[PDB]
Paper text:
To confirm that full-length Bpa in its unbound state behaves similarly to the previously studied truncated Bpa constructs, we determined its structure using cryo-EM. Similar to the crystal structures published previously, our model confirmed that the Bpa protomer forms a tight four-helix bundle. However, in contrast to existing models, our structure showed that the helical extensions of helix H4 exhibit greater flexibility. Our cryo-EM maps showed no discernable density beyond Bpa residue Q140 within the H4 extension, indicating that the residues following Q140, while possessing helical propensity, are dynamic. At the N-terminal side, the first Bpa residue that could be resolved confidently was S36 which is located toward the same ring face of Bpa as the C-terminal H4 extension.
Alternatively, the 20S CP can associate with the bacterial proteasome activator (Bpa) and degrade proteins in a pupylation-independent manner. Unlike Mpa, Bpa facilitates the proteasomal degradation of its substrates without making use of a tagging system like pupylation and without the expense of ATP.
Author numbering:
A (entry chain K), B (entry chain L), C (entry chain A), D (entry chain B), E (entry chain C), F (entry chain D), ...: 36 to 140
Write the structure that this text describes.
Amino acid sequence: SLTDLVEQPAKVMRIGTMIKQLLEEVRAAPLDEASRNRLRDIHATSIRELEDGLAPELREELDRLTLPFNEDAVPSDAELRIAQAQLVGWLEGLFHGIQTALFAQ
Amino acid sequence: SLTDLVEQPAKVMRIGTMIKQLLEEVRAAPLDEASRNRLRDIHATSIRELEDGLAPELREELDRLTLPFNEDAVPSDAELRIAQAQLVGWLEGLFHGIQTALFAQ
Amino acid sequence: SLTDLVEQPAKVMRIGTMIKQLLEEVRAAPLDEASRNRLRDIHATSIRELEDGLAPELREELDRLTLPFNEDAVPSDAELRIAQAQLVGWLEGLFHGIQTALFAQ
Amino acid sequence: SLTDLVEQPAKVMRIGTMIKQLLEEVRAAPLDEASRNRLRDIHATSIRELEDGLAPELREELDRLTLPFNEDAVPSDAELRIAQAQLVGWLEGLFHGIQTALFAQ
Amino acid sequence: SLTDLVEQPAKVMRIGTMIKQLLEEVRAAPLDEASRNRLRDIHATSIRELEDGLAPELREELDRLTLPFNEDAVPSDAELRIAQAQLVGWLEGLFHGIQTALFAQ
Amino acid sequence: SLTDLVEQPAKVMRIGTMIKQLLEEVRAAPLDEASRNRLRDIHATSIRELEDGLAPELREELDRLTLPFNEDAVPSDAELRIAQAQLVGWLEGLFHGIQTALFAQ
Amino acid sequence: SLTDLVEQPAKVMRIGTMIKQLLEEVRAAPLDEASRNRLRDIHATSIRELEDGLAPELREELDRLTLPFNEDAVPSDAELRIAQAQLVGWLEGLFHGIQTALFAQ
Amino acid sequence: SLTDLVEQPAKVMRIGTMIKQLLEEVRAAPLDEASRNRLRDIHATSIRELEDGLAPELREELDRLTLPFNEDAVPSDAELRIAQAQLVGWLEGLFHGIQTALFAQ
Amino acid sequence: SLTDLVEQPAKVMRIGTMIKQLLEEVRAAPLDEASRNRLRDIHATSIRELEDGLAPELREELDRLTLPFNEDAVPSDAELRIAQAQLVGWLEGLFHGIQTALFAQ
Amino acid sequence: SLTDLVEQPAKVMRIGTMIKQLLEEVRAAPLDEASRNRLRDIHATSIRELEDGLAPELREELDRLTLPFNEDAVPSDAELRIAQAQLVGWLEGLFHGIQTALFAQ
Amino acid sequence: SLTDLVEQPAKVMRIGTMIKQLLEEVRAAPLDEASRNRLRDIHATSIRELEDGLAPELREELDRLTLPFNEDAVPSDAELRIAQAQLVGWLEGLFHGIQTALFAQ
Amino acid sequence: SLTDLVEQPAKVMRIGTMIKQLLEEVRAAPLDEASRNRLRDIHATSIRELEDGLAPELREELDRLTLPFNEDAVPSDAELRIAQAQLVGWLEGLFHGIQTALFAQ
């Protein structure tokens, strides 16, 4: 069912909270080259961790939605904001959807 | 009936939340070329995912309402805002309408 | 009666929500040529969809009230604001009127 | 009686809401030539629609109060604001008066 | 008595609401020549309509209080504000006085 | 007694409301020559109407307190503000005093 | 006793309210020569009216406290503010004192 | 006792209210020479009136605390503020102290 | 005990209120030479009055804490603020301490 | 289970509070070279302490997510903000996840 | 026990309140040479008074924490702020700690 | 257990309150050389006092976390802010952790 989609919810929740805090921090003040490089590395590793904790259906959905960054160029602040906002929105919708079914029962 | 139109509501809800978060992010600060290119790709893939989760009637309605972006040019920030606002409004109306019938019962 | 005028309320409600969100987006920030062209296309298609969901009496009333845009020129932001405000006001009044009768019963 | 004056209240209410929304939109931001031309056309058609929905007594009262625009010149923003404010005030008073009698019963 | 002074209260109430809305509109933003000419015409016709709905005692009182505008000159914004404020205040006092007696009973 | 001093309270109340609204209007924005001339004429006529509605004791008191304007010169905005403030204060005190006795009973 | 000091309270209350309104008006905006001349005349006449309504003890107290203006010079705004503030404070204290005794009973 | 110290409380209360109102007026806006001269005269007469209404113990205490102004020079605004603040504070403390004993009983 | 330390509380309370009001007045606006001279004289006399109303233990404590001003120089505004703040704080603590014991009983 | 993952919760909670306070301090005002060097040393030692208090599964997860700083260069303020925000978000998610299970029981 | 540490609480409380008021006054506005000299003298005498009212354990603790000022130089405003803040914090913690034990009983 | 870690809680609480007050004071306004030297001395002595009041486990943990300042250079304001923020956060976490266990019982 809908609840069976999320394999382990705690890992997904903590990765989502980490990504949301990073997005808030980036929106707070502008970054520089090294900060954005670290941010891209975090984005890649966090997406991998999130995929490890999801069902294959949602793994494929998230793979279709998200596009990995180009490793040869340093992303700008706006690109990182777009990627993090997309991922935060997707997770916020996922948890809202599963909790809708949970509250329905 | 009205509720039978939405095939799987959870996917639609999470795609809508993702699109709303992206719209808020874009309204927050201006973007650049690569950010808008990523935004156009997200818009196309998200519309496809949304259509995969709707009835053929609503699929055709949304196809009539929404126009795909031109792949040969980078859309400006205003065009992306218009498209995302149109889609967010359409989904907000769709869920309001279906929940009106649900509350009616 | 008054309730029988609205053939299918869900479609009208969601088109109204889409148009209202687009009006808010246009009021938020100024647009450019392509954004206004897309906005005019959305306006035409949305009026057609709204007419498809109304009784012939209200179809004729809305036809008398609304004037289609000139396809040979790009409307300014103010003209689009005027048209969207007129349509949003008309729909807001329509639903208020029908719900007055519904609450009366 | 007072209630028998308003032939069909729903049409009057929705035309009033449309006119009020247009007035708010015009007060929000300044208009240009084409916007004001569209606004004058809306004003004429809306007054005709409103008169079609009123008793002959109120039709004559509204005819005495309102003066049609000159078709040979483009009205300024202030003239349109004055006309719309006058019509909105007249309708607000009309509904307040009829609802006073309704609440009296 | 005091209540018998107001012949038909609904017409007086709606004319008062129209005049109050026009006063608020004029205080909102400055006007130009044509707007003030329309405003003078509205003022004259509205005073006539108000007098048609009052007792001869109040007709004479209002005639003593109010002075018709000069038809040969365009009144300034301040003169129109003074006239509309005087009339709005007089009507606000009239209704307050009659409702004092009504609440007394 | 104190209540018998006010011959007809409704006329006094409505003249007081008119004068208070005019004072608020004058405080809102500055006036010009014609506006102040109209204001002086209103002041004279309003004082006469107020005196017609008061007992001879209060007529003489108000005559001692108030000084008629010079008909040969246009009063400045400050003089009109002073006169209107004096009259508004006197009426506010009069009604407070009579209502004190009324509440005492 | 304390209550027997105030001969007629209504006249004192209304003169106090008039003086307080005049003080508020003067504090609102600066005055000119004629306004201050009218203000001095009002001050003299109002003090005489207030004295006519007080016991001889309080008449003498108020005479000691208040100093009449020089009739040969136009008082400045600050002098009039000082005089009006002194009189308003004295009356505010007088009524507070008498109402203390009234509430004591 | 403590209550027997205040011979007549009403006079002290009204003189204190007058002095407080004058202090607020002086803090509101700056004064000129004649205003400060009037203020010094008020200060002297008010201190005498206050002393006439106090016990000999409090008379001597207030005499020790307060120093009369020099009659040969016009005090500055700051000196008058200091004197009025000192007297207002002393009276505020006096009444607080006596009402402490009154509430104790 | 703690309560027996304060010989007469009313005098201490009113001197404290006077000093607090003077401190607030000095913080409000800057002073000049004569104002500060008067302030120093008030400070000396107020300290003497406060000492006359305290037990010998608290007299010696306050003597150790407070240092009299130099009579040969005019203190600056900051020095007077420091001295008044020290005295206000000491009195605020004294009354808090005694009321702690009073509430304990 | 989920609760058994956190070996000792008190140490993790206090290290998280320390890191959060440091992040708030860094966001408050900009730092200099020595402050950032101290901050990097604190970051390394705090990560080691946090790892000492976590299960091997969470140790490996946090190792994958976090990247140690380069010891040969002084990180900029933005890099330190990014690292601290990532760690604060991860801990906030971890505790939210474990408390979800605790509240579930 | 913890309560036996504070020999006499009233003296400590009033010295703490005096020091807190002085700190607030110093933070309010900048000081000059003589004000800071007086402030240093107050600081020394107040520390001695506080030590006279504490147990030998807390006397030694406070002696270790606080460092007396150099008598040969005038401390700056920042040094005095640091010293007063340290002492206020120490006293605030002391009373919080003792009241924790008191509330525990 | 967790509560047995804190040897004497009152001393730790008061040292923490002192350090927090000093941190707030430093954040309030910038310091100079002597203030920062005094601040470094306070920091060293306060850390020693805190260590004297903790268990050997927490002593070693705090020793690992905190690095003593260099005695040969005057720390900048930012370094002192970082150190004080780290210590305040560590203590806030420590007390939160111990009170979690206390509330658990």
